[PDB]
Design an enzyme around this catalytic site. Structure first.
Site, PDB file in Angstrom:
ATOM      1  CB  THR A  26      -0.942   0.043   1.207  1.00  0.00           C
ATOM      2  OG1 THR A  26      -1.846  -1.039   1.057  1.00  0.00           O
ATOM      3  CG2 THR A  26      -1.792   1.326   1.217  1.00  0.00           C
ATOM      4  CB  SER A  45       2.192   0.081  -3.742  1.00  0.00           C
ATOM      5  OG  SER A  45       2.532   0.212  -2.376  1.00  0.00           O
ATOM      6  NE  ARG A  77      -0.377  -4.992  -6.852  1.00  0.00           N
ATOM      7  CZ  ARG A  77       0.726  -5.112  -7.591  1.00  0.00           C
ATOM      8  NH1 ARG A  77       1.938  -5.086  -7.034  1.00  0.00           N
ATOM      9  NH2 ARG A  77       0.616  -5.254  -8.910  1.00  0.00           N
ATOM     10  CG  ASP A 120      -1.606   1.157  -3.769  1.00  0.00           C
ATOM     11  OD1 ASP A 120      -1.763   1.502  -2.576  1.00  0.00           O
ATOM     12  OD2 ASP A 120      -1.462  -0.035  -4.124  1.00  0.00           O
ATOM     13  CB  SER A 167       4.594  -1.821   1.984  1.00  0.00           C
ATOM     14  OG  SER A 167       3.649  -1.836   0.932  1.00  0.00           O
ATOM     15  CG  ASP A 211       5.878  -1.192  -1.804  1.00  0.00           C
ATOM     16  OD1 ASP A 211       6.704  -1.981  -1.290  1.00  0.00           O
ATOM     17  OD2 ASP A 211       4.713  -1.046  -1.375  1.00  0.00           O
ATOM     18  CE  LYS A 248      -4.678  -0.307  -1.434  1.00  0.00           C
ATOM     19  NZ  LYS A 248      -3.207  -0.473  -1.495  1.00  0.00           N
ATOM     20  N   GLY A 287      -2.438  -1.099   6.273  1.00  0.00           N
ATOM     21  CA  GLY A 287      -2.393  -2.191   7.236  1.00  0.00           C
ATOM     22  C   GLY A 287      -3.427  -3.249   6.907  1.00  0.00           C
TER      23      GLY A 287
HETATM   24  C1  LIG Z   1      -1.926  -2.264   1.794  1.00  0.00           C
HETATM   25  C2  LIG Z   1      -1.367  -2.255   3.227  1.00  0.00           C
HETATM   26  S1  LIG Z   1       0.382  -2.676   3.472  1.00  0.00           S
HETATM   27  C3  LIG Z   1       1.034  -3.960   2.421  1.00  0.00           C
HETATM   28  O1  LIG Z   1       1.215  -1.413   3.344  1.00  0.00           O
HETATM   29  O2  LIG Z   1       0.500  -3.180   4.893  1.00  0.00           O
HETATM   30  C4  LIG Z   1      -3.440  -2.572   1.822  1.00  0.00           C
HETATM   31  C5  LIG Z   1      -4.370  -1.420   2.317  1.00  0.00           C
HETATM   32  C6  LIG Z   1      -5.711  -1.673   2.043  1.00  0.00           C
HETATM   33  C7  LIG Z   1      -6.198  -2.687   1.198  1.00  0.00           C
HETATM   34  C8  LIG Z   1      -7.558  -2.862   0.989  1.00  0.00           C
HETATM   35  C9  LIG Z   1      -8.481  -2.035   1.608  1.00  0.00           C
HETATM   36  C10 LIG Z   1      -9.828  -2.272   1.352  1.00  0.00           C
HETATM   37  N1  LIG Z   1     -10.779  -1.539   1.938  1.00  0.00           N
HETATM   38  C11 LIG Z   1      -8.023  -1.019   2.454  1.00  0.00           C
HETATM   39  C12 LIG Z   1      -6.653  -0.846   2.663  1.00  0.00           C
HETATM   40  N2  LIG Z   1      -3.658  -3.710   2.703  1.00  0.00           N
HETATM   41  C13 LIG Z   1      -3.596  -4.955   2.272  1.00  0.00           C
HETATM   42  O3  LIG Z   1      -3.396  -5.312   1.111  1.00  0.00           O
HETATM   43  C14 LIG Z   1      -3.760  -5.949   3.383  1.00  0.00           C
HETATM   44  C15 LIG Z   1      -2.363  -6.342   3.833  1.00  0.00           C
HETATM   45  O4  LIG Z   1      -2.473  -7.165   4.983  1.00  0.00           O
HETATM   46  N3  LIG Z   1      -4.464  -7.102   2.864  1.00  0.00           N
HETATM   47  C16 LIG Z   1      -5.371  -7.739   3.600  1.00  0.00           C
HETATM   48  O5  LIG Z   1      -5.709  -7.438   4.750  1.00  0.00           O
HETATM   49  C17 LIG Z   1      -6.010  -8.893   2.865  1.00  0.00           C
HETATM   50  C18 LIG Z   1      -7.203  -8.320   2.097  1.00  0.00           C
HETATM   51  C19 LIG Z   1      -7.715  -9.309   1.040  1.00  0.00           C
HETATM   52  C20 LIG Z   1      -8.244 -10.574   1.714  1.00  0.00           C
HETATM   53  C21 LIG Z   1      -8.833  -8.631   0.228  1.00  0.00           C
HETATM   54  N4  LIG Z   1      -6.354  -9.867   3.898  1.00  0.00           N
HETATM   55  C22 LIG Z   1      -5.508 -10.875   4.207  1.00  0.00           C
HETATM   56  O6  LIG Z   1      -4.395 -11.037   3.710  1.00  0.00           O
HETATM   57  C23 LIG Z   1      -5.950 -11.721   5.392  1.00  0.00           C
HETATM   58  C24 LIG Z   1      -5.856 -10.698   6.500  1.00  0.00           C
HETATM   59  C25 LIG Z   1      -4.950 -10.712   7.536  1.00  0.00           C
HETATM   60  C26 LIG Z   1      -5.314  -9.653   8.333  1.00  0.00           C
HETATM   61  C27 LIG Z   1      -4.607  -9.362   9.464  1.00  0.00           C
HETATM   62  C28 LIG Z   1      -3.473 -10.091   9.816  1.00  0.00           C
HETATM   63  C29 LIG Z   1      -3.069 -11.151   9.006  1.00  0.00           C
HETATM   64  C30 LIG Z   1      -3.798 -11.465   7.847  1.00  0.00           C
HETATM   65  N5  LIG Z   1      -5.112 -12.905   5.602  1.00  0.00           N
HETATM   66  N6  LIG Z   1      -5.569 -13.829   5.406  1.00  0.00           N
HETATM   67  N7  LIG Z   1      -6.070 -14.776   5.190  1.00  0.00           N
HETATM   68 MG   LIG Z   2       3.623  -7.919 -10.583  1.00  0.00          MG
END
Ligand SMILES: *[C@@H](CS(C)(=O)=O)[C@H](Cc1ccc(CN)cc1)NC(=O)[C@H](CO)NC(=O)[C@H](CC(C)C)NC(=O)[C@H](Cc1ccccc1)N=[N+]=[N-]
Ligand SMILES: [Mg+2]
Ligand SMILES: *[C@@H](CS(C)(=O)=O)[C@H](Cc1ccc(CN)cc1)NC(=O)[C@H](CO)NC(=O)[C@H](CC(C)C)NC(=O)[C@H](Cc1ccccc1)N=[N+]=[N-]
Ligand SMILES: [Mg+2]
Ligand SMILES: [Mg+2]
Ligand SMILES: [Mg+2]
EC number: 3.4.25.1
Lengths: 212, 226, 195, 233, 204, 196, 222, 196, 195
Positions: free
Chosen positions: B1, B169, B19, B17, B129, B166, B33, B47
């Site tokens: 993100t 992202s 993703r 972004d 990230s 990144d 987001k 997060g």
């Molecule tokens: C980027 C955050 S980062 C890499 O900088 O930490 C995005 C921000 C974001 C995405 C989507 C939305 C939607 N409203 C809002 C903000 N965050 C993510 O990509 C997170 C990174 O953890 N992804 C998730 O939480 C995913 C979402 C998908 C299922 C759609 N969930 C999982 O990976 C779950 C969650 C999980 C949660 C907490 C701790 C550990 C794992 N895991 N599983 N299964």
């Molecule tokens: Mg790629």
């Protein structure tokens, strides 16, 4: 992984599946779990893929050196013991092997030796090794007799692997069959489970648990 | 993100972004987001996606009821204070990292909020990230009294830095512009620099390729009636 | 508790359950009945952690018996199994979960059909033609896959069950001291005293 | 197996049309203590190569001696030591990369990340990275530690692919490096204001610049920032 | 130990031209042991379809929970719930167990009865919504399904073409996963007819 | 973090750096660690930013409610409320707070509250990770009843050294002067203090 | 504690045709969420009409390729410039890999070339040297995404003759080099969309009786 | 432990406290941490007493054997031998050594060797647990080319503060002066330095 | 390996050893002979870790057979047991110790006396009238304490051994698949084929 070998009136039947896994990932459906050491010796492979391939290929080299030096075919007992003494040297290091050395010699007759990586070496009439061994044992022990036709024995070995291929998640792909006689081993083909299963279901009337 | 926020002449702007990821796989290629709180208050989330989403919706719901009760436009400090007190309560177990920005009768505001309940005030901020890629751009190019046109450029550039450099992202750039005395303009898919190229082949199958054992009609209606 | 098997044939359900009760070093008993009658046409066999097994079985038995008196009516095997599943599914997120796996064999008097349900300690329910819990299934399912037919008589079901028990006696390391077999059909529940 | 004690932070670098630039600050940190303020982490080898080193300083000083010893050894029975048989960047790198991988494979690594910047005999730019694991890679921009996260994004805006290298002059490339060093000073807690910069050009040779300082810093906006949310004074 | 990979199984959903498709395998296991070859993972509440992968006790529990909630919804609202609203209900219900979650990967599929618009959505175990135009994947072979869908899929497929695409995505993904397979079901959903098909696949 | 409060003739001065770090990354380089709990009662925060903000917000609430009922609270009273929160929740807090204030009766007062939740009234106090490096300097150079200009120099020179040696400290030096005259904010930039 | 292993990401793909073979790999090199390089070659010409890639931990990959290249050199010296056949190369690689059985090369190795009858050949190894000759194999990060697709498109799995009910399989065929490259490109484009470690560029090495040819294609850089 | 070496016009002075602790017990309150590896090459020891004694004894042996063959070794040569032992045995040593010496050619030189086994040539050096508290003081007060009396005061004032704040440091302040004139030992008692 | 028993009667030593070989889940064999003939009048039974048991037994066998050829003479049971004990006592402080427990039953032709030695994997030797290794002794020693007499015949020794095996079959959890019995006397070693 399901491998089995059993002794009967007409020699030895050897059947194995063909699946290799890395956890729940199906790495391959076309793996060879039988090594052809010579015209009268076979080796089955279960456990670590590399450990079995490497050391059973090495075993074949040691069996060849024996017949060069002694001008005579290595006995099944001697061949199995070369491998069991080797894995025993490595004990505790983490080698993973379950194997059967199957062959005929004039002095022994048809012989099967189970060898594994914790150093066990057993002679016997029936063995099943691998994650699907219990499933193979179920079918095999029920329909086993000493005096099956070579045709019936080949079918039972095939059917026992099929039973395991179905129930065991980590077994499948295809069934490789062998028959060992006085004259040597004979390959009896590769049988894909995705075709064999349905064939067996219809002809036998088994697998009534499945939607078919 | 990669999320970011920065201030300009008579406003504040947020960028993000699109993703969403699960470990190394891309769960969502186009996700929003930039969350909504009030008509002129917005929240960039990073997060844990469910947590960032849930906490903004909850505070947004309470901000709406507060606004109705007091007959006033909600303030960004109210959203800030409510978010941080909720997040602090849960001791970082709600893994939401947020950039809150908005306009109200007091003026324009830009804050960041961390999962444990700490808050910052800034003229330009970034989280997630891709924050370091974004902050490198913001540190190189941010100045006082930016125009709106310069601000959108800088914000989208900061988000792009994250998208390219990144792995966390990717995909598109969303922007939200909140200017004093004007309606907030939410610009989803502001940039689209990662459209998939046309495929070499079409994998559409001949009909009857798949083997079928049974067929049946599913009754989805209420009562087939006499 | 070790081995519990179930097989649903044409007109009945057959439950086979081991007799051994082992506490660590010694076999304390060789005639233990690992089953409770929940209603006249519904039998539940069980296996799992010591104490929890019987406590759970008797708790279920009391609740079904209470229902029977209140409504002057026998719940269907399906309804009983759904009740049991919910109790286990509630249990798994408790302070201390019931570690109990069950088979529920019943004859549905309305539909005139035998029914066999397999439920594990998590609350994972499945209706089956034949079932087992723990390591039993590893040996016995391959046999049942081979020999089972839906139109089998009760006598054929018992012969198929002997073949399952013989295979378990050959290849399992633990001496489970044979099995108590019980048949559930339209006439109710009866025990096969010679097996 | 050890742990790093006295450490050096980011080394940053990039290719430009006629050569390479490499830079690194003059700090030797002792955890959070900014212990040593006069540590040179760019080490020239001949007149065509500069080795920039981050990570453990004692292991850096060991590597520094290996390179000094390499020059001596190359001169032995070598009438062309200052001509056709002089040390190349690619020879110096491959030596270091061999050492790094051997040391990790004995479970006793040199706790560093190294960037070898230079210009070859035929005028080609050389820029390659190696670290404590023996992992190697090349790219138009390279950076270690915090530089990877902050400098690379800025330097990649100038040279985003191979075809951008002939379009980038030494003034533009040096400007980008100097800006990246300022960004790192704002944002890296284990960095310093004082740094060294080296340019290896195929025409003008090795230019080594010492005692540079981060300048034109933006702090004025700080006076207006008050509290952490609701405070107005 | 990992609850989401004890029982195994997969769900995939796809949109087409004036239609959606949702499909699932039939396996229920205890790790390596296959137990049931009839464990369906797709349920429906009126015209909204819900597929659920993951821990099987939670699959069953959530089905029973959403049946409960959609029945009460219908009695009070005097109309069947729509896919967009149901999606929010699933998300709400999952997130309320934020710190003791159901170990599931739900997938919503359906056509909005008023607008006629095809709709699919996926969730993580705590309710984060992924609303996709193209497809949603879930289960132990989700990586395999992502690979199949991402290459095989094209937009605006007719119902009988979409059937072939989703079926081949499921079947080939399942054959590369030890804990999936043992049969499969595909629902083709149109505005006022739904066809259900059981697929022939390899039984290992 | 480098923070300090110093009493002098006319009142008291609070001083702080502006760096907030997450490991080795500087999350905020222009942080305001001098925070207002009452008109002429301020505090310097060190430790967990979440914890010290949560505490300071509660204290501000308590002193606002105190003022509505009982009039202006003493600096001692403010320090006591800080202590009560820190001490009673010592198992769940990482907070090191310096409380500084101006009464007309008591003049300038400084109280320090370290991790345990103890209170210590002092002529001056230093705290935060960067304070370790200036114990020697501050002890040698502090005098009682300094002028405003001398106390500003004392703080500026002290935090300059703390910043120089501590990686966790840096940025601008903020100060807040508390006297009868009122509340004055001061800021000093790197180019000024680094060359000292 | 010192961890001697790392993960440099990437993905590789070998396909064996009738009289040719391809070995493709993406050119992205990563650690964690950072891109190290957008163009770091991963598939190498090793001489004797053999191409090789060792995907996973790049330091062990480079070491292995370097050792195999040297093994080819010494095979020439010791056996009168005899051409190392692909089957002999494969067995030699098994011994290289197994030699470190108790401190493995953390890589998934694939080689491609032509067998002694001139037919296309691909061999694939696990980290400790178990190998198999295959017609189709993807390795690395996105191998789970790519392999089911190849099963379907190269080996025609789960595909039946329409109208046969489901009793005549689609018959197996060799693909043209042009067809293989289309499937390779679509595999990597798809993998790039859904896997964060795949992207930047795609480099394909094609092996025929005429020699080793290269092709390069751009991939998405996000 | 508080130790420091300071170059000045006529040569170099080494300084140290005299406290050795086992936890909170003072095992020896009159330790001599200034140790002779050659006539006019001395060192200050910090870290494991066993390790630093073992190293210093080996160095003294090496420089004695050097002198028999090649004449008087330079201070740089002594620091290199210290470094070689510390660096090559870094996994099994906890040694922080300052090496100080006087040549007639090079005059006063100071080398510091911290835990890792790196070498750093400096105008002055400070080390040991008590040094953290005087980084600020020493940086502000050190000048190059001080007189003997100024350098003695600088060391005395510095270690006085180190001792004041560090529990691990204490006792007497020992010093060793290295000039062309020879080798002079100085000692300063608590009643002198505490009142500074 | 599980149960090994030994009993020294008037004129012979009787060794009983279980036939089962279990690897985790399955019983791989039910006819395994857990014994080696070291010399014509000395038999050694063994139990312990897989692989180590047979490797050790055969290593001892080879050394005793080598001694017999070199000296044209059979070592006394006492001498063989002391050799075996030293090898185990050397083993316990090795890089990887032999995890093997043994019983050595022999007839001393010089003294005209049966002798039974019990040696554990540590090299702990004891001469006994009856002995066992592992959990066997917990059940069987109380029987042997009750029923044993030094002047028993071989037939009485075998009847007493049946009572030991019956008790083990009743109260032990593991199915050890019966025992192979061997008698060591003045005429040498022979196997009782029906037990
Ligand atoms: C980027 C955050 S980062 C890499 O900088 O930490 C995005 C921000 C974001 C995405 C989507 C939305 C939607 N409203 C809002 C903000 N965050 C993510 O990509 C997170 C990174 O953890 N992804 C998730 O939480 C995913 C979402 C998908 C299922 C759609 N969930 C999982 O990976 C779950 C969650 C999980 C949660 C907490 C701790 C550990 C794992 N895991 N599983 N299964
Ligand atoms: Mg790629
Ligand atoms: C079944 C045995 S089982 C499930 O009952 O334990 C097969 C039998 C078998 C397969 C293949 C061959 C010859 N090629 C002979 C016998 N064995 C396997 O499936 C094993 C089970 O562990 N699989 C492996 O060894 C796999 C094979 C690869 C082709 C996927 N390899 C690995 O698991 C290693 C593990 C590893 C090793 C070193 C470093 C890191 C990881 N590779 N991986 N991943
Ligand atoms: Mg299977
Ligand atoms: Mg499968
Ligand atoms: Mg600083």
């Amino acid at each position: 992984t399901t491998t089995l070998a059993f002794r009967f009136q007409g020699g030895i039947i050897v059947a194995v599946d063909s699946r290799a896994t890395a956890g729940n990932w199906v790495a391959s459906q076309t793996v060879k779990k039988v090594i052809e050491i010579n015209p009268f010796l076979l080796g089955t492979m279960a456990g670590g893929a590399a450990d079995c391939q490497f050391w059973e290929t090495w075993l074949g080299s040691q069996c060849r050196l024996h017949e060069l030096r002694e001008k005579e075919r290595i006995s099944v007992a001697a061949a199995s013991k070369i491998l069991s003494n080797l894995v025993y040297q490595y004990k505790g290091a983490g080698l993973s092997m379950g194997t059967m050395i199957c062959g005929y010699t004039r002095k022994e007759g048809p012989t099967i030796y189970y060898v594994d990586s914790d150093g066990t070496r057993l002679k016997g009439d029936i063995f099943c090794v691998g994650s699907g061994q219990t499933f193979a044992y179920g079918v095999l022990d029920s329909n086993y007799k000493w005096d099956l036709s070579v045709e019936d024995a080949l079918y039972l070995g095939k059917r026992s692997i099929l039973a395991a291929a179905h129930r065991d998640a980590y077994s499948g792909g295809s069934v490789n069959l062998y028959h060992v006689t006085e004259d040597g081993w004979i390959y009896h083909g590769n049988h894909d489970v995705g075709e064999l299963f349905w064939k067996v279901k219809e002809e036998e009337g088994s697998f009534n648990n499945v939607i078919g | 993100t990669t999320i970011a926020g920065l201030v300009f002449q008579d406003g504040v702007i947020l960028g993000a972004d699109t993703r969403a990821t699960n470990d190394s796989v891309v769960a969502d290629k186009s996700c929003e987001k930039i969350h909504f709180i009030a008509p002129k208050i917005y929240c960039c989330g990073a997060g844990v996606a469910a947590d960032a989403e849930a906490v903004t919706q909850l505070i947004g719901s309470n901000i709406e009821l507060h606004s109705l009760y007091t007959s006033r436009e909600p303030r960004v400090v109210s959203a800030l204070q409510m978010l941080k007190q909720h997040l602090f309560k849960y001791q970082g177990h709600i893994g939401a990292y947020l950039i809150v920005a908005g306009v109200d009768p007091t003026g324009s505001h830009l804050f960041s909020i961390h999962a444990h309940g700490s808050t910052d005030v800034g003229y330009y901020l970034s989280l997630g990230s891709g924050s370091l890629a974004a902050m490198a751009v913001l540190e190189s190019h941010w100045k006082q009294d930016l125009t709106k046109e310069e601000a959108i450029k800088l914000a989208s550039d900061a988000i792009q830095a994250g998208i390219w450099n990144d792995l966390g992202s990717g995909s598109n750039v969303d922007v939200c512009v909140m200017e004093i005395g004007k309606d907030a303009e939410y610009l989803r898919n502001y940039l689209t620099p990662n459209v998939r190229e046309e495929k070499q082949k079409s994998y559409k199958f001949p009909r009857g390729t798949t083997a079928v054992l049974k067929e049946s009609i599913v009754n989805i209606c209420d009562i087939q009636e006499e | 508790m070790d081995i519990i098997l179930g097989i649903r044939v044409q007109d009945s359900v057959i439950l086979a359950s081991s007799k051994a009760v082992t506490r660590g070093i010694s076999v304390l008993k060789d005639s233990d009945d690992k089953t409770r009658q929940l209603s006249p046409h519904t039998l539940m066999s069980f296996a799992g952690e010591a104490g929890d097994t019987v406590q759970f079985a008797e708790y279920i038995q009391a609740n079904i018996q209470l229902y029977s008196i209140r409504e002057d009516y026998e719940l269907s095997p399906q309804a009983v199994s759904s009740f049991v599943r919910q109790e286990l599914a509630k249990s798994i997120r408790s302070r201390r979960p019931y570690q109990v796996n069950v088979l529920i064999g019943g004859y549905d008097k309305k539909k005139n059909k035998p029914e066999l349900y397999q439920i594990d300690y998590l609350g994972t329910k499945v209706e089956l033609p034949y079932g087992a819990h723990g390591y039993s299934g590893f040996y016995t399912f391959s046999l049942l896959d081979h020999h089972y037919r839906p139109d089998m008589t009760t006598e054929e079901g018992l012969d198929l069950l002997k073949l399952c028990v013989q295979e378990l006696e050959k290849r399992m390391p633990m001496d489970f001291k044979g099995v108590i077999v019980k048949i559930v059909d339209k006439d109710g529940i009866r025990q096969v005293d010679d097996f | 197996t050890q742990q790093p004690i006295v450490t050096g932070t980011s080394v940053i670098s990039m290719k430009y049309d006629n050569g390479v630039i490499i830079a690194a600050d003059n700090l030797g940190s002792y955890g959070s203590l900014l212990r040593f303020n006069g540590v040179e982490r760019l080490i020239p080898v001949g007149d065509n190569t500069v080795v920039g080193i981050s990570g453990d300083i004692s292991d850096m000083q060991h590597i520094e001696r290996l390179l000094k010893d390499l020059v001596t050894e190359n001169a032995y029975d070598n009438p062309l030591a200052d001509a056709e048989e002089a040390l190349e960047p690619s020879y110096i790198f491959e030596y270091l990369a061999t050492v790094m991988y051997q040391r990790r494979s004995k479970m006793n690594p040199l706790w560093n990340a190294i960037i070898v910047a230079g210009v070859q005999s035929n005028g080609d730019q050389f820029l390659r990275y190696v670290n404590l694991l023996g992992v190697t890679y090349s790219s138009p921009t390279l950076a270690t530690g915090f530089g990877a996260h902050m400098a690379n994004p800025l330097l990649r805006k100038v040279v985003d692919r191979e075809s951008d290298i002939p379009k980038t002059t030494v003034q533009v490339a040096e400007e980008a490096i100097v800006n990246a060093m300022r960004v790192l000073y704002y944002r890296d807690a284990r960095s310093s204001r004082n740094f060294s910069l080296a340019i290896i050009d195929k025409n003008t040779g090795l230019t080594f610049k010492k005692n540079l300082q981060v300048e034109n810093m933006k702090w004025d906006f700080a006076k207006d920032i008050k509290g952490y949310g609701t405070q107005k004074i | 130990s990992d609850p989401s990979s004890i029982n195994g199984g997969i769900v995939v959903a796809m949109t087409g031209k004036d239609c959606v498709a949702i499909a699932c395998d039939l396996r229920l296991g205890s790790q390596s042991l296959g137990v049931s070859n009839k464990f369906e993972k797709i349920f429906h509440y009126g015209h909204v379809f819900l597929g659920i992968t993951g821990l099987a006790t939670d699959v069953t529990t959530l089905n029973e929970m959403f049946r409960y909630k959609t029945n009460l919804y219908k009695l009070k609202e005097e109309r069947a719930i729509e896919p967009e609203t149901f999606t929010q209900l699933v998300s709400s219900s999952l997130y309320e167990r934020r710190f003791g979650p159901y170990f599931v990967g739900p997938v919503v599929a359906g056509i909005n009865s008023k607008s006629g618009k095809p709709f699919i959505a996926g969730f993580d175990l705590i309710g984060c919504i992924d609303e996709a135009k193209d497809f949603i994947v879930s289960g132990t072979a989700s990586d395999q399904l992502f690979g199949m869908c991402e290459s095989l899929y094209e937009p605006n497929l007719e119902p009988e073409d979409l059937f072939e695409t989703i079926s081949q995505a499921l079947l080939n993904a399942a054959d590369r996963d030890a804990l999936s397979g043992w049969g499969a079901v595909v629902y083709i959903i149109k505005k006022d007819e739904v066809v259900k098909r059981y697929l022939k696949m390899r039984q290992d | 973090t480098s923070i300090m409060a110093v009493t002098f003739k006319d009142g008291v001065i609070l001083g702080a750096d502006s760096r907030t770090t997450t490991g080795a990354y500087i999350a905020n380089r222009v942080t305001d660690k001098l925070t207002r709990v009452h008109d002429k009662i301020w505090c310097c925060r060190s430790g967990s930013a979440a914890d010290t903000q949560a505490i300071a917000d509660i204290v501000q609430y308590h002193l606002e409610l105190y003022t509505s009922q009982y009039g202006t609270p003493s600096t001692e009273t403010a320090a006591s409320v800080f202590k009560e929160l820190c001490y009673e929740n010592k198992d769940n807090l990482t907070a090191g707070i310096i409380v500084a204030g101006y009464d007309d009766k008591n003049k300038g007062e400084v109280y320090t509250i370290p991790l345990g939740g103890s209170v210590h009234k002092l002529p001056y106090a230093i705290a935060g990770s960067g304070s370790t490096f200036i114990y020697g300097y501050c002890d040698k150079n502090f005098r009682e009843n300094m002028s405003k200009e001398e106390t500003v120099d004392f703080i500026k020179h002290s935090l300059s050294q703390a910043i120089k040696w501590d990686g966790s400290s840096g940025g601008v030096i903020r100060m807040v002067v508390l006297t009868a005259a009122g509340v004055e904010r001061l800021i000093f930039y790197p180019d000024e203090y680094e060359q000292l | 504690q010192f961890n001697p292993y790392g993960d440099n990401g990437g993905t590789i793909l070998g396909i064996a045709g009738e009289d040719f073979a391809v070995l493709a790999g993406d050119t992205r090199n990563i650690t964690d969420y950072s891109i190290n390089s957008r163009y770091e070659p991963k598939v190498f010409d090793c001489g004797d009409n053999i191409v090789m890639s060792a995907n996973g931990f790049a330091a062990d990959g480079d070491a292995l390729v370097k050792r195999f290249k040297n093994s080819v050199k010494w095979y020439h010296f010791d056996h009168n410039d005899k051409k190392l056949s692909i089957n002999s190369a494969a067995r030699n690689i098994q011994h290289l890999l197994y030699g470190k059985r108790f401190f493995p090369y953390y890589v998934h190795t694939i080689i491609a070339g032509l067998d002694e009858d001139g037919k296309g050949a691909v061999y694939s190894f696990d980290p400790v040297g178990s190998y198999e000759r295959e017609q189709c194999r993807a390795g690395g990060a996105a191998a789970s995404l790519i392999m089911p697709f190849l099963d379907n498109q190269v080996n025609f799995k789960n595909q039946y003759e329409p109208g046969t009910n489901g009793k005549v399989k689609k018959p197996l065929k060799y693909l043209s080099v042009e067809e293989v490259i289309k499937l390779v490109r679509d595999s990597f484009t798809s993998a790039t969309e859904r896997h964060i470690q795949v992207g930047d560029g795609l480099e394909i090495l094609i092996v025929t009786k005429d020699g080793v040819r290269k092709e390069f294609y751009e991939l998405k850089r996000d």
